[PDB]
Amino acid sequence: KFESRKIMVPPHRMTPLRNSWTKIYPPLVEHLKLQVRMNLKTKSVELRTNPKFTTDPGALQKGADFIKAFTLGFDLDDSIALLRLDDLYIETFEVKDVKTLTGDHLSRAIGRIAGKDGKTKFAIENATRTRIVLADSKIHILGGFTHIRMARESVVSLILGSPPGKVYGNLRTVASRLKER
Amino acid sequence: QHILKNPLVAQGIVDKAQIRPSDVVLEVGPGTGNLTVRILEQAKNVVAVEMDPRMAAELTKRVRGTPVEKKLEIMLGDFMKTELPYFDICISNTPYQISSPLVFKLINQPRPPRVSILMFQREFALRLLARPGDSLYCRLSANVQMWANVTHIMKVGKNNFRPPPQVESSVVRLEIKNPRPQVDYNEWDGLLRIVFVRKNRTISAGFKSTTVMDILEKNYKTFLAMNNEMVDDTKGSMHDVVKEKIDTVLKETDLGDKRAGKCDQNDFLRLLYAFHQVGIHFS
Amino acid sequence: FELSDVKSSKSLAEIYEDDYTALSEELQKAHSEISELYANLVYKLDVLSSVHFVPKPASTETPTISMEDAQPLYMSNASSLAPQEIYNVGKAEKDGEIRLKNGVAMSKEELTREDKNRLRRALKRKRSKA
Amino acid sequence: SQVFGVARIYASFNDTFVHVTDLSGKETIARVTGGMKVKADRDESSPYAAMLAAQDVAAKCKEVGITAVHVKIRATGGTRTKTPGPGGQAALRALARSGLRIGRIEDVTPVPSDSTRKKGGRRGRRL
Amino acid sequence: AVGKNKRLSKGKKGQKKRVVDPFTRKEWFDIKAPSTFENRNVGKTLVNKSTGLKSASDALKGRVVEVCLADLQGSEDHSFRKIKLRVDEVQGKNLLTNFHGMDFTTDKLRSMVRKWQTLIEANVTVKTSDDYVLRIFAIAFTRKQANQVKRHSYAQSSHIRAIRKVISEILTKEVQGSTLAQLTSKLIPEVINKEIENATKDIFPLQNIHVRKVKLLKQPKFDVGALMALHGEEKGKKVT
RNA sequence: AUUUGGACAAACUUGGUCAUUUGAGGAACUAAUUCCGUAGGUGAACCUGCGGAAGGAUCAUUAAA
RNA sequence: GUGAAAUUCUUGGAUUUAUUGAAGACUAACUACUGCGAAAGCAUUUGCCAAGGACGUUUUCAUUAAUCAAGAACGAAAGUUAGGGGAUCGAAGAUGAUCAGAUACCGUCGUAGUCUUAACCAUAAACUAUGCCGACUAGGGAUCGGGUGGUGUUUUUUUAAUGACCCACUCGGCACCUUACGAGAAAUCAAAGUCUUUGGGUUCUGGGGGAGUAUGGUCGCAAGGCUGAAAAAGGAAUUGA
């Protein structure tokens, strides 16, 4: 009853996949019992589950999601967390999805999201217990459902233009409330 | 909120209010209560309305013990949905968002007060004082100018507020025309709305819009229905036959090519009279 | 409090493990350290300003013995408690009664009218004093 | 040996449909919906909601006798966003767990070549 | 919401009782693909009923299934293409289908389009010898030489226009000399794009040359004989 | 269709009638982000449409096998 | 649909699914510190009409040039007049909810506009916050257009193209990185430089903030011309006397 899945890897995320590959297949094969492969002649990773060795039906889907998140550009240990639990999701969107920005404005907006030395993005991640990755313009958020909702909320305010000072204030408020609860 | 910080401007408001010792004064927005104590000193009866129990309680504890307590009255809650008894003078320091409905409720108030000293935004007060032919002229300006006479009093900077807001204000004196002119509010409102849909166009074009002729068609049709007569058959649209009717009235008036921003009250009322004669009623 | 604008050293896996698992252990660490070093200081000053020899106060896992024990080592805490603090008496639970301090329990209904009045005036003057 | 359906997973931004159909999408088999399994409206687009939705549709599909499904996930597309959300991810996981044989996953999100204006207005939509 | 506090709207006035039992009243049909592909039996579909053979025949004359050549042919390397078949002649539980269109998968398109090269899209409308008016979209990307050092490989508008002309004339020559069954037989093993490469090999070195999409626009007068031949008569059992 | 005479006679008035419900005194008892051009604004301590500007805080990945 | 809801639409089956059809805009990814243009501005395909820079040139005229008031051409978005079309978004407006918190102030409908032709309007942080023409004064790579040369791969060979890459050179661009023996109060500037105090040609222009005041320095904008009321413990109080 072997069951298969295929997920492609862009090139700029294909070098690090090789670099940290040796820390990738052990969690796939030892704890999920999931035969793996990398068709480097089609730049894809193929996960197939064996009829007899695997146990959990959902192991295949969690594995596909884990590799997919790593492909979108998350750190290896973060993606491993996505394997470990069962309630971690990834949400993506774009600056033009929020507000149509052209060229230099869009660059400034990504600058305002990142904050100097990433201070802002790290603040959001630490506050709401999620991981954010800016692609060129796509931005991706990994975390629990309500957490990524809050992170998206703050990020969208940043995109519209609230300065990082006010945004950071709001973050510390919600952080205090979440810590007390 | 924002706190007043000038007893001299309070003195000025009272002086230009020019209270008579036989009056009853309706006060909106007491604040810390200096105006309340001054008006209780000057006038005969005072009723002050408030929506915030905290300033209400602080005011009543500030006034309790004085002999003017028998004459002062305080009314709590929102006052757009309650009954307001007759008051000879009005004084208002309210936040503006209710202030516009305050103006219109006061004008609509049966047995309207003699004078009302109000505080408004600088822009809003320029709107109320907007004379025809001035850029600020608005439908609100037309309504208020032909149901009441308005006149500026003084201008209040943002710096005279704790904490200061960022829109400069002013104090204005509103005098309801007693008696009210014998014109229908709803019809006059419909006229102003249609003509001021875009204040700098031509009224011919403003009528040339679609939904305006649709509504006018329905109104004239129900008018001729209650009068119990039928119209001549139109080759195209009933909206178009009443459109040519409006064309006739516009050409005979010779107002079709005039700016809504430059027409005065007199032109508007003459146009309304022409419509009333021809059988058009916007309400 | 304050947030951390530096990169988090532990990923989601770890922070959720932490959420899976005296106020601040750092606070007790600093407290213990300052206590020790202050003991050192008072040692130094007592040596300087006393008249008689004073020894260095002390030096500063697995099951431990307690050589000091502020009880005779054969006394049960059930026997070290005193009757007042394990049961005083207080106001009765049912609304139909009042229960004074000295252990009488009253029923509001079976009291006579004058009794009702006198108990009243007593409660009134107590509440007035308070 | 088996038979295939097509599970169309419309993960809107504040709801989720899991609509199973036959090949050729004509004959709809079972359709459930977020709030429909979750009686509220904050949670009408929640991963828990989609999980229950997919479980029930797996039941109904196993009723009809279809054992495998290709899947076409979808976001609202258009001028709005264009990537399937947590709702769709949750539905997919729940169903593959439920044990229908997943055949081929696609993301058929309608991506406008050249869209009209979007609802926000010049100042920007959200917040 | 099915909550108690979700107040009733005009809405839930008069319902209808679930008594129909739809998937008991319905019925199963199996379809078959033309003889070009290798696996011709693919999936089954549902027909509302059979009381109206009008309904049965009409539903299955409107149907159009859409499969992936990997499933159709057994080789997993055609995973990204995806064809559309429409059934138009039905007989004895068993549907006969012919070619109706092509596409890639959105994943593959996003996968091919990268950032430091030029995209070229050619677009030709033609008609086969079978009288099937057709529309073909092809794409190509300007790759780079084996000793490039320049970061990008951009082509000039002149090279772009030349390559578009070559692609257009190749596509139209091929699919005007062909027939539609012959068209699919060519389009399966990626041979038109091998031609496109081998022709444009002197203007500019390209990569990822693909016939992106095929679109039917008009169909000729129907031909049941042609269908049966393309797929490569019966008695009953004496009920009494 | 219309017409005669009765009783019933709804309903109304003026009441009478009994019946039941519902205002301040007396008298008891119990209980205790900044900005620009233009256009507009009536729930305006300011807001909105359209086109612009920075005179506004960039982290991670990235040649190729 | 939002933070939360709500008008709204839904047994005459809405949201969703499949196959099509129409209508009007729009031209995604490819999109870069790249291109074009006098600026505003300009991205689907093919065709036609003219136009343009650069480069190549042992072609040609032979000072025809530079700076320049008046005037003219064009001039984003909004706006006006008259026609056309009117899918989408959408000032005004009409409405829902007004629930704490605004940390998370919006939802449904929508005139005018947006689109188009013919005229007006002539303004923007129209920015490289800096009149133009000429000349000289530092190194370095990359990149776009043209040309010359070299060399091997990619290519192909009596048919119609003979293009891609690499390397040196080369004019001309969009910008960039290093620094100035220079300049400047400093930021910075390849011009904002051109050896201590000054002449390459030419046009326009000049002699901070808030406050407090005088106004004949001046321009706007107002009203009414029958209409009026007379001191309290004679308290507080489930808390008191």
Curated annotation (Swiss-Prot), chain A:
Main localization (coarse): cytoplasm
Subcellular location: Cytoplasm; Nucleus, Nucleolus
Keyword Metal-binding: no
GO BP terms: endonucleolytic cleavage in ITS1 to separate SSU-rRNA from 5.8S rRNA and LSU-rRNA from tricistronic rRNA transcript (SSU-rRNA, 5.8S rRNA, LSU-rRNA); endonucleolytic cleavage to generate mature 5'-end of SSU-rRNA from (SSU-rRNA, 5.8S rRNA, LSU-rRNA); proteasome assembly; ribosomal small subunit export from nucleus; ribosome assembly
Cellular component, GO, one term: nucleolus
Keyword field: Cytoplasm, Nucleus, Phosphoprotein, Ribosome biogenesis, RNA-binding
KH domain segment(s): 103-155
Transmembrane segments annotated in the record for this chain: none
Effect of residue 111 to D: Temperature-sensitive
GO MF annotation: an example: rRNA primary transcript binding
Protein's job: Required for small ribosomal subunit (SSU) synthesis. Has a role in the processing of early nucleolar and late cytoplasmic pre-RNA species. Recruits DIM1 to nucleolar pre-RNAs. Indirectly required for cleavage at the A2 site of the 20S pre-rRNA, forming 18S rRNA, and at A1 and A2 sites of other pre-rRNAs.
Assembly and binders: Component of the small ribosomal subunit, ribosomal RNA processing complex (SSU RRP complex). Interacts with NOB1.
Family: Belongs to the PNO1 family.
Name of protein: Pre-rRNA-processing protein PNO1
Source organism per UniProt: Saccharomyces cerevisiae (strain ATCC 204508 / S288c)
Taxon lineage: Eukaryota, Fungi, Dikarya, Ascomycota, Saccharomycotina
Section of the entire sequence shown: 93 to 273 of 274
From Swiss-Prot, chain B:
Enzyme class: transferase
Family: Belongs to the class I-like SAM-binding methyltransferase superfamily. rRNA adenine N(6)-methyltransferase family.
Keyword Methyltransferase among UniProt keywords: yes
Organism: Saccharomyces cerevisiae (strain ATCC 204508 / S288c) (Baker's yeast)
SUPFAM superfamilies, per the entry: S-adenosyl-L-methionine-dependent methyltransferases
Lineage, top ranks: Eukaryota, Fungi, Dikarya, Ascomycota, Saccharomycotina
Protein name as it appears in the record: Dimethyladenosine transferase
One GO cellular component term: cytoplasm
Pfam families named among the record's database cross-references: RrnaAD
Protein location: Cytoplasm; Nucleus, Nucleolus
Role of this protein: Specifically dimethylates two adjacent adenosines in the loop of a conserved hairpin near the 3'-end of 18S rRNA in the 40S particle.
UniProtKB/Swiss-Prot annotation, chain C:
Residues included from the entire protein: 398 to 539 of 593
Function summary: Involved in nucleolar processing of pre-18S ribosomal RNA. Required for the early cleavages at sites A0, A1 and A2 during 18S ribosomal pre-RNA processing.
Subcellular location: Nucleus, Nucleolus
Subunit structure: Component of a heterotrimeric complex containing IMP3, IMP4 and MPP10. Interacts with snoRNA U3. Component of the ribosomal small subunit (SSU) processome composed of at least 40 protein subunits and snoRNA U3. Interacts with the SSU processome subunits EMG1, IMP3, IMP4, KRR1, NOC4/UTP19, NOP1, RPS4A, RPS4B, RPS6A, RPS6B, RPS7A, RPS7B, RPS9A, RPS9B, RPS14A, RPS14B, UTP1-UTP18, UTP20-UTP22 and UTP25.
Family from the record: Belongs to the MPP10 family.
Domain of life: Eukaryota
Protein name: U3 small nucleolar RNA-associated protein MPP10
Swiss-Prot record, chain D:
Keywords: Acetylation, Cytoplasm, Nucleus, Ribonucleoprotein, Ribosomal protein, Ribosome biogenesis, rRNA processing
Single Gene Ontology BP annotation: translation
Keyword Membrane: no
Compositionally biased tracts (Basic residues): 118-127
Compartments where located: Cytoplasm; Nucleus, Nucleolus
Keyword Signal appears in the UniProt entry: no
Region of interest (Disordered), residue spans: 107-127
Post-translational modification: N-terminally acetylated by acetyltransferase NatA.
Coiled-coil regions listed in the entry: none
Main location: cytoplasm
GO cellular component, one term: cytosol
Top-level division of the source organism's lineage: Eukaryota
Gene Ontology molecular function: any one: structural constituent of ribosome
Note: Present with 29600 molecules/cell in log phase SD medium. There are 2 genes for uS11 in yeast.
Functional description taken from the UniProt entry: Component of the ribosome, a large ribonucleoprotein complex responsible for the synthesis of proteins in the cell. The small ribosomal subunit (SSU) binds messenger RNAs (mRNAs) and translates the encoded message by selecting cognate aminoacyl-transfer RNA (tRNA) molecules. The large subunit (LSU) contains the ribosomal catalytic site termed the peptidyl transferase center (PTC), which catalyzes the formation of peptide bonds, thereby polymerizing the amino acids delivered by tRNAs into a polypeptide chain.
Family in the record: Belongs to the universal ribosomal protein uS11 family.
Protein name: Small ribosomal subunit protein uS11A
Organism expressing this protein natively: Saccharomyces cerevisiae (strain ATCC 204508 / S288c) (Baker's yeast)
